[PDB]
Amino acid sequence: SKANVPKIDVSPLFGDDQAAKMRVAQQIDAASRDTGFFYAVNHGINVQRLSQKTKEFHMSITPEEKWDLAIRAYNKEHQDQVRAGYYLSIPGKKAVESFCYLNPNFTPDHPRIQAKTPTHEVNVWPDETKHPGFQDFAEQYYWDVFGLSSALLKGYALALGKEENFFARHFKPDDTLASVVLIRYPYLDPYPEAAIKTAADGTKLSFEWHEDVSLITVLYQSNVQNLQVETAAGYQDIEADDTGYLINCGSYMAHLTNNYYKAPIHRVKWVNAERQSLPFFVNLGYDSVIDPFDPREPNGKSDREPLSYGDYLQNGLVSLINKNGQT
Ligand SMILES: CC(C)[C@@H](NC(=O)[C@H](CS)NC(=O)CCC[C@H](N)C(=O)O)C(=O)O
Ligand SMILES: [Fe+3]
Structure with a gap:
């Protein structure tokens, strides 16, 4: 019934003790070849403050503000x-609602914004007087989870037998396509039946069910159990842990490794509870290319x-919407 999802102390990936880093890389390898998931602990991020500022935003935003910030589908x-x-x-x-933002360095003068390259956009933000400090908090959080993700990519490279900057050299502040999504899953009474699938x-x-569109996914969630992973023994439950980050590989990693590190198939159960789901999707730059290999x-x-x-991401985001629906 419960999936094997280990807790890995990732603190050595921020320092210079090389043997300690290799012992972390082995734990990453073992989890990647088993269910495909692990929890990163001792990561250094203040997740309680992240949850409090996100809740202040989700509970104070109004219908007027949502229409003013809405994506093209709405x-x-x-x-x-x-x-x-x-x-x-x-x-x-439809019960779920969310706010998505991209690299804060994608300003009106950035070269990819000037060229109108697919997948690149300038962020939109609520009024400062109505949400004091929100934009500054959210941009600082992008750089805090970017620093965690760069340390994790050093661990995945060592696990596969490569030098520690193998993936990190393609993950840069000036051009990463990575995104933060602040998702609100509400408590509702009565809960809408069209928002429940079987x-x-x-x-x-x-x-x-799906595979992720990412290199890796770095996720914080409230303490409410909801995710399941498909293993050789069927679908199994992933336990919640609101002190750690849940990590898994996406289908760009599976392509690069010839399915040695699979992108695990997983799904989200329906739970009638007020909760948060805050993913960071670790994407590379538009022109980044890593030659596929087979360990x-x-x-x-x-x-x-x-x-x-860039080619992978543009086709992957569309395929996921066509299969499972617009979020
Ligand atoms: C489990 C979480 C990862 C979460 N799922 C999700 O976020 C789901 C499936 S991985 N993800 C997506 O739909 C892709 C969002 C991509 C985003 N608009 C962007 O342009 O980069 C949830 O709570 O439903
Ligand atoms: Fe997913």
Whole structure:
């Protein structure tokens, strides 16, 4: 019934004790070849303050403000907002709602914003007088979770037999396509039946089976159990831990390693409870290309074609919406 999801102390990945880093890399390897999930602990981020500031924002924002920040799927006036902005709930039909923001260095003068390159957008923010300190807190949080994610990527590189900057050299403050999503899953009475899906095995869900669109995913959630992973023994429950970050690989890592580190298939159960789900999707730059390899082969060669991260991301975000629906 419960999935094997280990707790790994990732503090050595921030320092210079190389043998201690290798012992962390082995734990990452073992979890990646088993269920595909682990919890990162002793990460240094103040997650209680993150949860308090996010709750202050979700509970004070008003309908007027949501329409003013809405993405194109909800507001035809905002044609440049495909990824960044507010994703509304549909009272009586869709329960979840969220706020997505991208790299704070994507300003109006950034070269990729000037060129209108797909997947790059300038962030939108609420009024400062109505939400004092929110934008400054949220931009500082992007850089705090970016620093954690860079330490984790050093661990994945060592686990696969590569030098510690193998993935991190493609993950940079000036051009990362990474995103933060602040998701609110509400308590509702009565709960809308159209917002509850049912799986082939009978489980009630909020989001169906999928693989993630990311290199890795770095997730904080409230203490309410909800995720399941598909293993050889069927779907198993992932326990909650509101002091750590839940980590897993996305389908760009599976392509690069020839499915040695699989992107685990997972889904979200329906739970009638007020809770938070705050993912950071670790994406590389638009032109980043890592040549595919195969760790199970002596010469490390694979028969897969190289794919740029920008091409992967644009087609992956669309495929996920077509399969499981607009969020
Ligand atoms: C489990 C969490 C990761 C969360 N799921 C999600 O966030 C789901 C599935 S991984 N993710 C997505 O739909 C992709 C959001 C991408 C984002 N708009 C962006 O432009 O980069 C949830 O709580 O439902
Ligand atoms: Fe997911």
